[PDB]
């Protein structure tokens, strides 16, 4: 699949807002992920013991994790589809070290869309959401192809 420049512009325009507060968006997204799909929390040894949203909101480790995910994702989106180099080390660590099934990448995709929708209604209408979904699907498709080459494709 391939996105048009118009679709990339919609994605990057809302992302510019996310970047005004990377830590805040990272927390919201991870908390949304962990509450909607608790099984995912088990993958994070440094934060799996957190029982409530209040504990999550106060966690310094959770906030650092959020910044890391959004910074790596942002670097990928800014490549506008030319992200093969950025995807390799990422696919290897999630396939071989962490063992993250594609299904969980779909779950975090949902959390991202949910949060942008809440915090940026004016820059996240239907067209912009369609573009973001398309960009995240592109990301998932390429990652899963890499998973298979690496022997996981879980």
DSSP-based three-state secondary structure for 114: helix
- Using DSSP, how many helices (H) and how many strands (E) does the chain show? 7, 0
- 105 sits near ligand HEM (criterion: CB under 6 A): yes
Answer for which of 29, 69, 128, 135 binds ligand HEM (CB under 6 A) is 69
Q: What is the DSSP letter of 43?
A: G
Q: Which residue lies nearest ligand HEM, judged by its C-beta?
A: 93
Q: Does 150 bind ligand HEM (CB under 6 A)?
A: no
Q: Are 113 and 132 in contact (CB under 8 A)?
A: yes
Q: Which is nearer to ligand HEM, 50 or 108 (CB)?
A: 108
Closest CA to 83 of 20, 7, 154, 146: 146
Q: Which stretch binds ligand HEM (CB under 6 A): 2-10, 22-30, 66-74, 122-130?
A: 66-74
Residue 5, Cβ density class (10 Å: 0-12 exposed, 13-18 middle, ≥19 buried) = exposed
Check residue 10 for interaction with ligand HEM (CB under 6 A). Answer: no
Restricted to residues 16-35, the positions that interact with ligand HEM (CB under 6 A) are none
Residues that bind ligand HEM (CB under 6 A): 40, 43-46, 68-69, 72-73, 90, 93-94, 98, 100, 104-105, 108
């Amino acid at each position: 699949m391939v996105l048009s420049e118009g679709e990339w512009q919609l994605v990057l325009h809302v992302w510019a807002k996310v970047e005004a507060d990377v830590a805040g968006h990272g927390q919201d997204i991870l908390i949304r992920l962990f509450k909607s799909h608790p099984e995912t929390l088990e993958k994070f040894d440094r934060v799996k013991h957190l029982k409530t949203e209040a504990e999550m909101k106060a966690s310094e480790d959770l906030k650092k994790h959020g910044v890391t995910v959004l910074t790596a994702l942002g670097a990928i989106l800014k490549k506008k589809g030319h992200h093969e180099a950025e995807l390799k080390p990422l696919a290897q660590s999630h396939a071989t070290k962490h063992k993250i099934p594609i299904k969980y990448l779909e779950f975090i995709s949902e959390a991202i869309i949910h949060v942008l929708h809440s915090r940026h209604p004016g820059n996240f209408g239907a067209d912009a959401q369609g573009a973001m979904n398309k960009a995240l699907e592109l990301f998932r498709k390429d990652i899963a192809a890499k998973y298979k080459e690496l022997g996981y494709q879980g």
